[PDB]
């Protein structure tokens, strides 16, 4: 005790590494050396995490899943959020998710997240858990984006007010020499905004949603970074069975995207899924897990799909329906 937790930076830094986020901040105030060590632990948080509301979560009683799940699962999280990504099922017209979430996050944290009829979430406990197409169910995940040195995943929500350049340029969509992927989620305009950056060497991820629930039109994330690598595929009607689905995901894997510091985004037509797959759901996700054992599955089922199969690594065509957008986002490796 005399020289262990002080005068010895490696020990304190490590022990803090074995702490959660809230307690990380709380114990940040203990000592200046401890404060610097938690600063280091924060700078090496170049990862992602998500809460989950999966297996038999609703039951006969759950007590505000969208609140309790996030509150409890903000306890074993190490990454200090810098931007919030989440989802939750929709099922007078009111809402309290924007209250609960925006209250559980730092006052200086932009919030992204949507409510959709269906949502795709990878079960917690391990990234290798089986993704399950939740077309109907009361659930949701909360993907937390910390500050990723050299990766500024800056959100945006541009409304269909009765579109000026400066508005878009502010968030880093246009006139941005670093954007790599966009998350075009459209609630209840989508064309021109998409066009504003379509003619670019990027990857376009997005779809059509019903309503938004948090941000301090169309909402997406201007993924910016050279270390960012990714690709996409269009699982159209031709992908309607195990053979075709697995062939399509083999084509996707042919891009050779790393599985390290990476996310898996699945966008599909609301019709696509269990009913569309002859009384068997998760086929696309089944192939996803089989070929990408560790990557997690995210995105949602929407009435529309935005994306063209493209591949990028260092150095109207996007409008379609009744198809799927297998979108994988890889964040690069730290140093």
């Amino acid at each position: 005790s005399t020289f262990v937790l002080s005068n010895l930076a490696e020990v304190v830094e490590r022990v803090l590494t074995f702490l959660p986020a809230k307690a990380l901040l709380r114990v940040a105030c203990v000592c200046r050396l401890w404060r610097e060590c938690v600063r280091r632990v924060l700078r090496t948080h170049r990862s992602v995490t998500w809460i989950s509301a999966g297996l038999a979560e609703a039951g006969h009683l759950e007590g505000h899943c969208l609140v309790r799940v996030v509150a409890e699962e903000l306890e074993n999280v190490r990454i200090l959020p810098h931007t919030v990504l989440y989802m939750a099922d929709s099922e007078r017209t009111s809402m309290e998710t924007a209250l609960a979430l925006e209250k559980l996050f730092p006052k200086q944290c932009q919030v992204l997240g949507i409510v959709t009829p269906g949502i795709v979430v990878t079960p917690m406990g391990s990234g290798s858990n089986r993704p399950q197409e939740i077309e109907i169910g009361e659930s949701g995940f909360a993907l937390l984006f910390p500050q990723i040195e050299g990766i500024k995943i800056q959100p945006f929500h541009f409304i269909k007010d009765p579109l000026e350049r400066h508005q878009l340029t502010e968030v880093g969509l246009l006139d941005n020499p670093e954007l790599r992927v966009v998350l075009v989620f459209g609630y209840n305009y989508l064309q021109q905004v998409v066009s504003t950056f379509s003619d670019m060497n990027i990857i376009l991820a997005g779809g059509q949603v019903d309503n938004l629930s948090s941000l301090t039109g169309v909402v997406g994330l201007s993924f910016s970074g050279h270390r960012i690598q990714s690709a996409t595929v269009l699982l159209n009607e031709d992908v309607s069975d195990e053979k075709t689905a697995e062939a399509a995901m083999q084509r996707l894997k042919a891009a050779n995207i790393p599985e390290h510091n990476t996310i898996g985004f699945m966008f599909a037509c609301v019709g696509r899924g269990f009913q569309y797959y002859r009384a068997k759901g998760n086929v696309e996700a089944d192939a996803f897990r089989k070929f990408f054992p560790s990557v997690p599955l995210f995105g949602f089922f929407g009435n529309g799909e935005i994306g063209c199969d493209r591949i990028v690594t260092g150095n109207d065509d996007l409008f379609h329906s009744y198809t799927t957008i297998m979108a994988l986002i890889h964040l690069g490796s730290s140093k």
Binding site: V4, L5, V27, V30
Partner: protein, 131 residues
């Protein structure tokens, strides 16, 4: 000391290729080799939580503060990744839940922030107050 047991420690593993340990005592040395003996058959270490610490090590780690911290000093000196990580898991488990108002007394942590900078860091980390 068994050749493989000593090799389990990264620090000693090298010097032999290129057994005095001036910065290690007999008692903590025996503790370390005992832990390795329990961990001798451990699979090669490929969440960092502390709720998954071994029960046998916990009982072996159910020691005084001075004992545990001397063990940590040795493991850092011997670069025994498993031992150091388990002891630090236990220490963090002790820290968890306690606010500075309790941690500072728990480890007699001599304060180092003036009230102004204290409030500055608290406001820079005001989310910490949320549970």
């Amino acid at each position: 000391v068994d050749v493989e047991i000593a090799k389990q420690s990264v620090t000693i593993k090298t010097m032999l290729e290129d057994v005095p340990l001036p910065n290690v005592n007999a008692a903590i040395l025996k503790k370390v080799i005992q832990w390795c003996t329990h961990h001798k058959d451990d699979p090669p270490p490929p969440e960092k939580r502390t709720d998954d610490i071994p029960v046998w090590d916990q009982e072996f780690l159910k020691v005084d503060q001075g004992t545990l911290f001397e063990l940590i000093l040795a493991a850092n000196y011997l670069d025994i990744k498993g031992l150091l990580d388990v002891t630090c898991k236990t220490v963090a488990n002790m820290i968890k839940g306690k606010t500075p108002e309790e941690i500072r007394k728990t480890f007699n942590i001599k304060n180092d922030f003036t009230e102004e900078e204290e409030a500055q860091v608290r406001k820079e980390n005001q989310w910490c107050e949320e549970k």
